[PDB]
Amino acid sequence: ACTKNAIAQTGFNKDKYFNGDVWYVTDYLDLEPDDVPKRYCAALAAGTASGKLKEALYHYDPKTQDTFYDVSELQVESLGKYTANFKKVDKNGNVKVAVTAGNYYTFTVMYADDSSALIHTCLHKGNKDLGDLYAVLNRNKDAAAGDKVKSAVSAATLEFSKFISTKENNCAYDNDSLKSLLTK
């Protein structure tokens, strides 16, 4: 179940966030903690491709080796708040599972600056969801969360100390695939 109406950043700068570059998940918190593993790797690219607002996702479970990419088309609900479809693809953009009505996620950018961000997502696959999932992002895959984003976690009435870090998992990412997937 998802339970939060996440509030987007006041004055969110869409073009800076959606610039075509990669964001790495450094820390995450699911309000239903059992919905996601204790150790995980995730990243995304976000940009406009031929006029269309896009995200490309990467998930990797470093214990099981479960790997998947997605390409997402975002629709705007309000500034910094989106509803995304998703198609599962290989790293080259070939479709494995096509876009379907019931497979979507919401995506809210609660805080962003040039180097860091805090997002909320509620994933739906048909009647199932993956809970309220918060993620701290950085442009540098090895960056410890700094004061701007940690303060934003506090301003969301959350505690950064309770987030799970991805840093001890030897995460390695294919940036090139994430950037190219934006076009697919």
Strand partners, 67: 60
Residues contacting ligand HEM: total by CB under 6 A: 22
Q: Binding string to ligand HEM for residues 82 to 101, with x set by CB under 6 A, is what?
A: ----x-x--------x----
Q: How far is residue 129's CA from residue 104's CA, in Å, rounded to a whole number?
A: 10
- Residue number, 17 or 40, with CB nearest to ligand HEM: 40
User: DSSP 3-state assignment of 31?
Assistant: coil
Tokens of 18: 């959606």
Per CB under 6 A, the list member of 22, 44, 109, 181 interacting with ligand HEM is 44
Cβ contacts of 110 within 8 Å, gap of 6 or more? 6, 7, 8, 9, 80, 117, 118, 119, 120, 152, 156
Check whether 120 is labelled as a binding-site residue.
Answer: no
Q: How far is residue 167's CA from residue 126's CA, in Å, rounded to a whole number?
A: 32
Q: Under rule CB under 6 A, which residues in 105-134 are in contact with ligand HEM? A: 105, 107, 121, 123, 125, 130, 133
**Least gap, CB of 114 to ligand HEM (angstroms):** 18
Chain contacts with ligand HEM (rule: CB under 6 A): 25, 28, 36-37, 40, 42, 44, 57, 59, 68, 70, 86, 88, 97, 105, 107, 121, 123, 125, 130, 133, 135
